Ligand binder design. Structure first.
Ligand code: BR
Ligand code: BR
Ligand code: BR
Ligand code: ZN
Length: 315
């Protein structure tokens, strides 16, 4: 005969708050659907008096929340908020030490691929379209990356603990970056057939699988011609702030003054592990919270990043 309530706020973006009166005799789940407090799932709990005035994250369940979720995350999937919160409940527990002047991630839950992605991004000029990513990234660069890591996992449909691949993760993450002005032009030349250019834009303009060497794209890559002879594919225009060269792991030597940063993959499956290498006053090998300085590195490199502004040949 009496409904006892506490006033709380619900939100999907942490800026637009919606006042709610929650009945203390019912769970949060019964009233709001899946609910989270500071990332912890409180769906099955009934309101505590001390929850008064606190802000809870909920799934976008009405027009207003859906619009707020889209504007902030650029997502239409209602479950996104749940997967983000689920991941954040874990990543908020991770440690993000400064290692060699960069924000790294202390090893946990097979997060070494995420640590490599984060280390590389900090060294590139890149900006994201979604406010949520932009903001989370600003924080990660400063040394606080729990939110950024959870968003990466949520956007890529991977869970904490799941094995990851740097190239695949970067690909999915760069699809959320503003690469509108990224452009690559290749010229394929055959002694007998002639020449033809291929233009690529966006993510495809900055990534390449097959060789770790940016110089190799410039010198030319052998390719089969429709006729049957061997043609040469040359990079003739590259307009981007960086390029990422990838290849299946194989012994490769990284030398100072020739690249921006890179990562190597040692082992397979349960023993597979990534470490990052960056070029500073000397080479730095960043392995989670561990730093090793060396004049050169030879190991199973799988991705190498290079800085760029504009590269063009006569064609
Ligand atoms: Br998760
Ligand atoms: Br940004
Ligand atoms: Br470079
Ligand atoms: Zn030909």
């Amino acid at each position: 005969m009496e409904v006892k309530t506490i006033k709380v706020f619900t939100t999907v973006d942490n800026t637009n708050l919606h006042t709610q009166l929650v009945d203390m005799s019912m769970t949060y789940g019964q009233q709001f659907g899946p609910t989270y407090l500071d990332g912890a799932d409180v769906t099955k709990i009934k309101p505590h008096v001390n929850h008064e005035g606190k802000t809870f994250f909920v799934l976008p369940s009405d027009d207003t929340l859906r619009s707020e979720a889209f504007e902030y995350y650029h997502t239409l999937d209602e479950s996104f908020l749940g997967r983000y919160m689920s991941a954040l409940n874990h990543t908020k527990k991770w440690k993000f030490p400064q290692v060699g002047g960069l924000t790294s991630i202390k090893w946990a839950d097979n997060n070494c691929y995420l640590s490599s992605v984060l280390l590389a991004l900090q060294q590139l000029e890149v900006k994201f379209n979604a406010p949520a990513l932009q903001e989370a990234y600003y924080r990660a660069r400063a040394g606080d990356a729990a939110n950024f890591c959870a968003l990466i996992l949520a956007y890529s449909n991977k869970t904490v603990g799941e094995l990851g691949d740097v190239r695949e993760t970067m690909t999915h993450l760069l699809q959320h970056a503003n690469l509108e002005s990224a452009k690559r032009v290749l010229n394929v030349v055959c002694k007998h057939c002639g020449q033809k250019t291929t233009t690529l834009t966006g993510v495809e303009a900055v990534m390449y699988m097959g060789t770790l060497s940016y110089d190799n794209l410039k010198t030319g890559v052998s390719i089969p011609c429709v006729c049957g002879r061997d043609a040469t594919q040359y990079l003739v225009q590259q307009e981007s702030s960086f390029v990422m060269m990838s290849a299946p792991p194989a012994e490769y030597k990284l030398q100072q003054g020739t690249f921006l940063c890179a990562n190597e993959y040692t082992g397979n499956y349960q023993c597979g592990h990534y470490t990052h290498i960056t070029a500073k006053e000397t080479l730095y090998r960043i392995d989670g919270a561990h730093l090793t300085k060396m004049s050169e590195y030879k190991g199973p490199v799988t991705d190498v990043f290079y800085k760029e502004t504009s590269y063009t040949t006569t064609i």
